Symmetry: D2
Subunit: 257 residues, 4 copies
């Protein structure tokens, strides 16, 4: 098949990349970074995220696989010394799909896909937005911001905000808070919220209408924002898996020992 390889750009990763290409040359694998079926990322989860966003247009045609030159990542879960074993099995593997988050921003409209999360903060503060779930006004949020995470993203930013870790087989999204003000006056739920497919969470401005919005590593200031809509994407990311590496096992290795 057609394949491409992105690299963290450090000496370690660039040289490992040139080796897999050479090993791939010993097969009928046409390198093609235009319309690849196999996308290999060498570096960290940050490198993988970039690889994902480079090709978010052809997710249903691509099977991703990540190699970590540094510490064990959640997407880059295969060790550098397994490279030669990878180049073989990719030539002759089953696919694993994770849910994605669809974010829509309306002005006075733009959509994005996130593998980890999409967050919202204010350009200077204070940050005030009304939270609306399925058209029902749920709360008015006062604080630093909000984070909407995918299943696979719960181990990332979501985790640092006190959110729960959920298995990627669960088609859902999770909203956590950032330093929410809670008075006898102002009131937020406090707890993280987990939404199923087809549930629409909408954030609506109260005073200011400029927000610092991010999707994964991308962080854009958006002006004249009228609404921000979160919902579990219809599109899914496909991973090529050559071995059994259980999510909970990945969680254990990352956080426990």
């Amino acid at each position: 098949m057609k394949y491409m390889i992105t690299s963290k750009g450090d000496e370690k990763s660039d040289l490992l990349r040139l080796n897999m290409i050479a090993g791939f040359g010993e097969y009928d694998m046409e390198y093609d970074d235009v319309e690849p079926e196999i996308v290999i990322s060498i570096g960290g989860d940050g490198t993988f995220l970039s690889a994902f966003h480079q090709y978010e247009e052809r997710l249903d045609e691509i099977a991703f696989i990540g190699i970590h030159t540094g510490h064990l990542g959640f997407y880059a879960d295969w060790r550098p010394a397994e490279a030669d074993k990878l180049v073989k099995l990719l030539a002759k593997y089953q696919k694993v799909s994770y849910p994605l988050l669809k974010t829509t921003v309306k002005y006075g409209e733009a959509t994005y896909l996130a593998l980890n999360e999409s967050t919202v903060k204010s350009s200077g503060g204070p940050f005030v937005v009304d939270v609306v779930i399925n058209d029902i006004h749920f709360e008015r949020f006062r604080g630093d911001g909000l984070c909407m995470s995918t299943p696979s993203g719960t181990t990332a930013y979501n985790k640092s905000l006190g959110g729960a870790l959920m298995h990627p087989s669960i088609e859902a999204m999770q909203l956590t808070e950032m330093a929410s003000i809670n008075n006898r006056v102002y009131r937020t739920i406090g707890s993280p919220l987990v939404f199923p497919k087809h549930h629409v969470v909408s954030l609506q401005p109260v005073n200011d209408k400029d927000f610092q919005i991010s999707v994964d590593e991308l962080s854009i200031l958006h002006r004249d924002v009228q609404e921000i809509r979160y919902e579990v994407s219809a599109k899914k990311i496909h991973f090529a898996r050559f071995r059994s590496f259980p999510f909970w096992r990945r969680v254990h290795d990352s956080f426990i020992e």
Copy 2:
């Protein structure tokens, strides 16, 4: 159909019960607390939980409905003044099903069903158990205890422990911690964990083998425990719904205003 009515036992609830029965007498509704198809609970969520456990043997034949004489509950979501409207619609409604938690306790075996959660604490402390997910040892927990919650239960005990609130349409279970010790020596994940169907969480003793185990309001001391197994039950609870009362709307009314 056959129906039965349990009451919190206070003057308010007992008299509301006698009225619905009388109103039910004006129809072809045979009162039968042996094999009822309709189980009505009048009181609070505590009354409802009892009603559920009285008939956990015939869940697939019963449609539950709760009336709250006190404050708005999550299971007892219908106001007392709607009683007469209830007795009518029940005579001629669609069913809503929530996931349940199956708990298994092995000795040197007993199973239970929970509508809210099952917890584990130690009889005198210290509490130490090994946590095993799908046969893989995940962590060794040191602290006060652990809580495994259903979707509908996340608004209860789970919530006070920092757990996330998840929609009851999601077939899953959530594990939270109780005052976990975290040293450079001892290590727990800290974050709540959300498991999908068919995932098995097993708790295994390290030193002591006696534990205070609860399922909902039931709290039993269990001796010579070898293992405690948690997994999303195959059985589901069925609610009779005569109106639209969205879960998130119930959450808003309960915690926000």
Copy 3:
């Protein structure tokens, strides 16, 4: 004595201000916003903070007092209807002093005073700084930022970050975290830290050297930062108190009912 009055600037507060001045005219109270002994703030805690910073140069010569035209504040603790009673007692009161936080920023030096807190975030992220206590390297922080709060400030930003509320009679400062990354790799204490007088907390850059630093409402981007030093200030703020309004009672009224 000499006195001055600042106002939130809304119709309510401006008119209450003109009334107290007039009532003050019936006494020997020279209005002087250059070298006042009595500084009265009418509005909210935000108005009070501004009043404090307008005169942070003569704290030992000023006795502050706040009136809240909106909701009960912690510094603006006196109701609008008590204005006439205030103008009287100020003419003929005991002083209450709260500890302040001294922040020092060195380049390749500037000091500030805070009544609530001083925070540090990164200009674009990621935020990485080494935390050094009394010259001993304590940890390397990875996350969104850090907050150092005064005793009276613990009810503010500090509170939303999970920090503890401490009585203002305690000469100390408290450091809380903002979404700290905690891996098997990266490690922070997680818990808030409370330092006594004469303890010096120093934040030192690791990669980037530009930080968004705030003291109370003031938020300045600082470039080429070498060090940020936190320590309990030698200066204290003085309040004029005409009645008994216990801190814990203020906390109760603000957060409980």
Copy 4:
């Protein structure tokens, strides 16, 4: 001086004890476990706590020192290999004092001292008590229980409950919550509270009057309880220190690396 030595009771500690005694025999140090001036604990913090409670009657006459045969403790901060160096310096050192917590229990009265904390839970639940600070009703607590920690105790149970770590030079006490219920109905402060000297926190029963009360390792069920009073003790514990081992350095070694 007179001295005594308690041991964890394991082979390691018992043999280290017999060695220090022998080394002490080479000096004019009369072993006396009745009225010792020097109390040495060999084991862990648990052993030290026991040593403290064995002699809580003569705290102002005793200087404690702890040796850890296992992992680094906060009270047992001296390594086993430093034993011979200890026996020398104790013969010819300065004292360090930490604040203690005084707990009073009234019936229809008994006092205790705690080095770490005193907690309150219910015998079967539910746990409901009114919290009263300096005679002012602050809140009505609904949940699992409450914990009142000393400065040195904040690194213990207090820490697992989300409490802040405070320096032992600060004469104060800190109250944290255990799984508190927070509805639109029931309301607790949520945040930990830090009280200075002379502040009295009183817990008063609402329905049940039986509570599981602990002070450090001691856990007693108390019946017919009318009130539980917490306040910073007038008594302090005295440590013999032969080197400089900063509290924050102890915290770093224990939790960071």
